[model samples]
Target: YTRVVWCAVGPEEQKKCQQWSQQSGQNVTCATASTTDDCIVLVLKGEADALNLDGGYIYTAGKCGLVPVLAENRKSSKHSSLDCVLRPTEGYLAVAVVKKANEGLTWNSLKDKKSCHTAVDRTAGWNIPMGLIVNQTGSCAFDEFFSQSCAPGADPKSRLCALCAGDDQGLDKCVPNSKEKYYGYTGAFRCLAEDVGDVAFVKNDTVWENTNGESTADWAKNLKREDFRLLCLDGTRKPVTEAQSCHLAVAPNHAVVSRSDRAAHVEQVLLHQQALFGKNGKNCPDKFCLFKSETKNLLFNDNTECLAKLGGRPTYEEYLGTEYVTAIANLKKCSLEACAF
Candidate 1:
């Protein structure tokens, strides 16, 4: 039987995958993988078929000979494309945000400021912004620029966690696990909201999605977009919506990948499954759902609307485009040795 290696992190996700298997009329079996790396190995060893991956992992998967067959198309008002593919707004944009009241702050004057990041190697929160900073400072001792930062994967005792406040019980402070209060996009933004950091490095939609009743959390429910501003590379700040012309870098969309040899089969099964579990699919809220998670990204991210055709784009490098590749390369160089950029 055909099988799809789903990188499921928890039981909820695994159960969903099993339902998808049954829904596929037994044509496809849903195999489980514990992590992205594990899914990569399974596919490479010909033990499983495919898995959905985040943008950051796509490059590694490609280098291991996996081919990206589908891209996740996110649905949002910021985009207007109707085709089952990426739109201009499909890829996320990284941005530096500071409270609007901090008028004295500018991109060029961020030295010694407190900063918050989603994680150490994330595309938007760490890689893009740090890559640019390293290009300017020629060092990975980013600790020198930010007096304190809450970058999740950094050494816990380092200054990167000086500003970190752990979870409710005051434990896991500066730790990389979700148990820490500030770990992902929302968490980084929360760090700024709670005054633990002067600026937050996150994706463009972060502020918009969390503020003004868009989020039910007490910290975010009352946040006004007017209270924040985006720091541009040219030393100027703009409203969050203008990130297109003033931002760190445009990231690539996530993708569903498989060995090139299984590309056709993977694509066929996904198309069939999406038709039944996608946006308006029949099994949507009852037997299965495609993208409806609130706090997890299992086989695919919750924000994804559907897997779109890559239009025969055979390689990860081609589909991700040149800008993303260059940015990743720059970051990789800076990551080689601490303070060696």
Candidate 2:
């Protein structure tokens, strides 16, 4: 009863969370949820203690009175002397990618292209890219912005899920879990690479990770780095290496959230739990590693360096930053149009 329960969004996540529970000596437990929203409600009702979330989900939970506990920190593009816990989180670049042969496609001309997203309510995937789209087109109908897409969380029968491929057995298509063939960053990029979609809204790291012989997955084995290009906001296309100059937005890193009453406890347990399994956790590589996964981002992003301490105990809005929060607020005005079934 004293354990902190983490809400897992799907069966795949639940599997990892169960193992984490066993390895944590029962200090942490798991509560399964069909979606992030359901997980948020679990914490709200005190049935669950905490759950890690993307920036957009954090906004959703924060609006429901949940508090930010820790931020997922990753390697700095450059070296830094500060401890991981003390270093300020540097957000990743959200980019629009397309095949080099698609010469005519640009951010300005993306009115009727096929698109792929990691999933809805994610930073690089839905929130940043779609938010920018609504901001630019002055049209609330994002569904029509892309003729078809593999946005995993949308209605499976909608145009948004048209490009999504189901699992190997052809089940759970567009279900918003790892089982979906076109779910997260890797899958979204694969959606672009396989020519299933015209563009993919992912981040700079995803391109590098899956291309240039970095990934050995059958679908990604031969994806050449030069074959892909990043779509710039000004209508120019640049090589993937130039993401700093050609990208949609810089998104806040994913963070853990919990109800106010459980926030402190969750934070305290995480500090102790990570010491045993975090990226630098002493028992990792020998026992279990919390930050690393089976070539798939499970409970936490595989690229995460550590779950770092939040500076100043910032509120959700403060952690999200004023600009991003405002952008999401403005874009969410089209929520009914985007989310209505």
Candidate 3:
């Protein structure tokens, strides 16, 4: 097939993917799936070409024989003059947040506290934070580390699921969907905002997106960014803006992954495709932005500058860095004795 069929994880992504199809004049197209793994299978089965994914999923897809194509390069925390596609990709900050009023809380004091998470098996939400906890505590029973949590994808009757509030109707409590009030990045943050949880594990963008009037959602309205702080590994806490300095872990950005056989073709098509819809792209902001999303982050991250070329050759293990790879492996191993975040 001449078309590069992208796998879309949800209707939102499919809708946007179709727009790209139309805008690209059929140069690109889409195939729909209900989840990331399904999308990955689509690529593997030759039903699709590629889809962007986070480091955690990249780890899974990579093990199943997918290759990293390009990284989601976003605006640098510090400005740089190099082209987005040429500059090194910046790691997304994974932070533990708490209300400033809870001044007594520190990284070490997190034991026995209620917590929030985006979902199970995600990068910032699960892998980074959980991996670090397992490493520091020298134990894998992290589910017991928190008194209660809204981990979303865990057993509904478990302590981990104790905090997730379904919808206003009181259904789907602890289900890993928007229906579960405390499910995703914003959902987990909302958990902390309402004092449902003592801390929320999320990326830097989650804080900036929901605080200081950046988001007008009922839960986030009037939420002051200054009122919250990021917990550091050293028992220190810093303002949200200082996440560059104070964070749990530096997460790898979401990037496109494809079967090895389709890697070069996916790379070539995406390189040209991004030029038209990428940041400052000819058609973007005027016609279509491949990076644009109704959810603020769909298909690719909202802050994505471009799908930058990989440095050196490709390997998810190499791209994600060994330190994190090692951390995730430890966590995964522990999961067999106990199982994941």
State which candidate has the highest lDDT: 2
lDDT of 3 by residue, 25-98 (tens): 99998898866767778887889999988788888787778899999997775647777887888788899999
**Candidate 1: stretches off by over 4 Å:** 9-49, 76-82, 85-90, 161-180, 295-299, 336-341
Query: In candidate 3, how many Å is residue 62 off?
Result: 1.1
Query: Across residues 54-146, which tens digit of lDDT does each residue of candidate 2 receive?
Result: 898888888888899999999985548988877889888999999999988888888888999999888889989888888788889998898
* Best candidate according to TM-score: 2
Query: TM-score of the candidate numbered 3?
Result: 0.88
Q: Write the per-residue lDDT of candidate 1 for residues 157-271, one digit (tens) a residue.
A: 8998877777788877766545567877878999998888889998887777788787778777789898999999999999887988888887877788888988888888787
Off by more than 4 A, model 2 = 77-79, 336-341
| Poorest stretch of ten by lDDT in candidate 1 | 332-341
lDDT for 141 in candidate 2 is 91
Candidate 1 global lDDT: 0.75
Model 3: C-alpha RMSD to truth?
3.3
Score each candidate by Cα lDDT: 0.75, 0.87, 0.84
Q: How far off is residue 245 in model 2, in Å?
A: 0.9
